[PDB]
Design a protein around this ligand. Structure first.
Ligand SMILES: C[C@H]1O[C@@H](n2cnc3c(N)ncnc32)[C@H](O)[C@@H]1O
Ligand SMILES: C[C@H]1O[C@@H](n2cnc3c(N)ncnc32)[C@H](O)[C@@H]1O
Ligand SMILES: NCCc1c[nH]c2ccccc12
Ligand SMILES: NCCc1c[nH]c2ccccc12
Ligand code: MET
Ligand code: MET
Ligand code: SF4
Ligand code: SF4
Ligand SMILES: [Br-]
Ligand SMILES: [Br-]
Ligand SMILES: [Br-]
Ligand SMILES: [Br-]
Ligand SMILES: [Br-]
Ligand SMILES: [Br-]
Ligand SMILES: [Cl-]
Ligand SMILES: [Cl-]
Lengths: 384, 384
């Protein structure tokens, strides 16, 4: 009953039977006759439907969803990692990185800055992924504490992204939270193509924890087995050259999670500069918007996540396709009251394109006419 | 200003000038003219002073100390370890051990059992020692949380024994506590002889963390540098064949710590059965009592720690030389209300000789006429 990757040849055959114009004519809250993955593929490949027209249709099909947007800010709690992903600066073989680790004091200080100075009520905790069982359990323990601590401070939504998770590691993290707490597990498969995955994440059976594709991809099934609800699959756009394959796999994974009763966000982060050991594929804005549009349209209750990997000009264009906006920096403990967050090449996972403070980014979204849930702008009579 | 091991040849020469009978005639609170280590050696080697007579003298020289005894119970929070000590079942190469790790729930439950059912107000937290910096920091983090949690529950004294500690690892643990909290760092050198140490703890530069003798031995100096106070050196009796060498080194280490203003307990645990990879030296009761007597006498403000490594019959004989009594089991989360603690060969560090419940052991000490501080016998109107 775990997720099984779809057979692309089978999806292609079903995609051939989809009437894409009829699909576009569907009322909001109406579901196509064919599978979501087949419809996504059919919309993707039918180039008589313009990308801008697909994006307009996606924004309308999602237009009823409330809240329109919510936010969380990432907080990297360490940049140690045992794995070796060739597109990521945190890879263990990158001896140039200055490695850092946040203790109790620093984690708490960062959460207070985010809460009081940035006005945010969503946070995400990130770590590397570790090889030996004891380290994995001790990481789960510390992140469980961070989650409980953020909820107790008044954060209303907590994400975590700490690697694949086995049953006993979920047990350790879970002793910190309740089954109905607003806690989302993030595990981005990066590529659902096993060969591209191996190229970037490494080979198995050699002490490289994220090289195990199968352990990673069933992490959400373990989380749902344990009685939790919120999950966040993702694809790293720019690893695999064939985007049609990845959108089929992601939509199929979302559909599986939906059928198990999960609430899923969907992440499609695009590559950013990093201290890489292998080059990646640059995906143009039209393809990327078409991918976002097709996923958002076929998965209208699963919010796309948009992040400050993208520059301000792209956020302007794409924000209507998103249901989560996540501004922040992938450096360890980077926030400081009144100051721009750090994004030091010597310690960050990658370089972001937008370094403006979260409360400025989110305040400008609100001023342009979209409320952001889990954002309390620290102004006026809410100004301290 | 770190501890420097004494030159045994130099101590021997000073020991030759000690008048051991005059030393015995010293009033309590009077200090011999020669160094503590030289006097200890001189008492050890002067076989015209009987061991029983040395033990009587030691008990009298310490007789004024208050409280006469205090207690703590060990709580092993995991039996994972990266090191390879050949006398220890937890060594990483022991593939027979069932490896266990206590999360938040289990640690808290164990502390509540110890507090309410055993009546104890001292606890010690133990782990393995880990190789990579991230694991060491995450272990320090979790043990710091355990220490804070025990203090908040009303434990009045907390020991920890989690391996050598570098400055940044002490920083992480330290964010959990205050500089004047009743927290004792334990780091038993095991043998102060570098060659015996290498034989059992392994060779350096190969991923075996406790093989670094120097990192280990200056851990207390780092702890004092950070502004803490309480420390607990130790020798594992039965590693090195020449006990006179080890008592000189231990007494010299205690004297150094005293000169830095520390409060030091001294541990001389004797070997117990384990899943070993090298045999050890059995030390008879007369030599062991003579060693305890000479250390207790020359170091009258530094409490010897006696544990349930020893059988009831030996505790009866030696308890007068101790200032700390520590009953318990070296298995992970072994305590259960109303039941004997577990000491499973499949998961414990070694097999103890006395498996009676701490409150029985400590209640019998109290009934025989020695109060035990940090023990509240759960009886009568203190019975719940
Ligand atoms: C936390 C997420 O960040 C993504 N990720 C990893 N490396 C990079 C990069 N150079 N640029 C952008 N995103 C990256 C992965 O999808 C990872 O899961
Ligand atoms: C926690 C302490 O237990 C001691 N130690 C390690 N192995 C054994 C054994 N087989 N028997 C008794 N004590 C042991 C070490 O001195 C270690 O530092
Ligand atoms: N979800 C991946 C981490 C993240 C969320 N928001 C971000 C902004 C910038 C960099 C990473 C993130
Ligand atoms: N101080 C070493 C751990 C310890 C304290 N008391 C014990 C009793 C039995 C075994 C270990 C201990
Ligand atoms: C910092 S990257 C995300 C978390 C984890 N290291 C992983 O790659 O799954
Ligand atoms: C469990 S043995 C004591 C703690 C640590 N593993 C060390 O040997 O120092
Ligand atoms: S993507 Fe995550 S697991 Fe891979 S190297 Fe980076 S931090 Fe480590
Ligand atoms: S004595 Fe401590 S470091 Fe050595 S193998 Fe045992 S638990 Fe590990
Ligand atoms: Br809204
Ligand atoms: Br790039
Ligand atoms: Br809110
Ligand atoms: Br007393
Ligand atoms: Br033995
Ligand atoms: Br007490
Ligand atoms: Cl994302
Ligand atoms: Cl001891």
């Amino acid at each position: 009953g775990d997720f099984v990757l779809p057979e692309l040849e089978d999806v292609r055959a079903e995609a051939a039977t989809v009437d894409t114009r009829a699909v576009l004519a569907l009322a909001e809250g109406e579901e196509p006759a064919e599978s979501r993955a087949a419809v996504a593929l059919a919309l993707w490949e039918d180039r008589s439907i313009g990308t801008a027209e697909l994006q307009a249709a996606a924004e309308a099909r999602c237009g009823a969803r409330r809240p329109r947007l919510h936010t969380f800010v990432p907080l990297y709690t360490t940049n140690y990692c045992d794995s070796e992903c060739k597109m990521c600066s945190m890879r263990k073989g990158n001896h140039r990185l200055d490695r850092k680790f946040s203790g109790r004091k620093e984690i708490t200080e960062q959460l207070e800055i985010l809460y009081h100075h940035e006005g945010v009520r969503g946070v995400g905790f990130l770590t590397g992924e570790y090889e030996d069982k004891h380290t994995r359990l001790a990481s789960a323990f510390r992140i469980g504490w961070a989650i409980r601590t953020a909820l107790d401070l008044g954060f209303e939504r907590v994400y975590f992204n700490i690697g694949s998770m086995e049953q006993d590691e979920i047990d350790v993290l879970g002793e910190w939270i309740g089954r109905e707490d607003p806690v989302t597990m993030c595990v981005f498969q990066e590529s659902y193509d096993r060969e591209t995955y191996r190229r970037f994440m490494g080979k198995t059976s050699v002490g490289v924890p994220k090289a195990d594709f199968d352990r990673r991809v069933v992490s959400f099934d373990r989380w749902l087995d344990a009685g939790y609800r919120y999950v966040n699959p993702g694809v790293l756009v720019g690893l695999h050259d064939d985007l049609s394959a990845e959108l089929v796999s992601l939509v199929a994974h979302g559909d599986h999670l939906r059928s198990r009763g999960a609430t899923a966000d969907l992440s499609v982060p695009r590559m950013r500069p990093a201290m890489k050991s292998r080059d990646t594929t640059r995906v143009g804005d039209d393809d990327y918007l078409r991918l976002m549009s097709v996923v958002a349209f076929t998965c209208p209750e699963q919010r796309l996540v948009l992040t400050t990997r993208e520059p301000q000009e792209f956020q302007d264009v794409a924000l209507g396709l998103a249901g989560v906006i996540s501004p922040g920096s992938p450096d360890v403990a980077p926030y400081r009251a009144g100051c721009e967050a750090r994004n030091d090449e010597k310690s960050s996972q990658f370089l972001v394109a937008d370094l403006r403070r979260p409360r400025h980014i989110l305040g400008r979204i609100e001023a342009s006419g979209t409320p952001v849930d889990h954002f309390v702008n620290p102004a006026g009579e809410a100004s301290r």
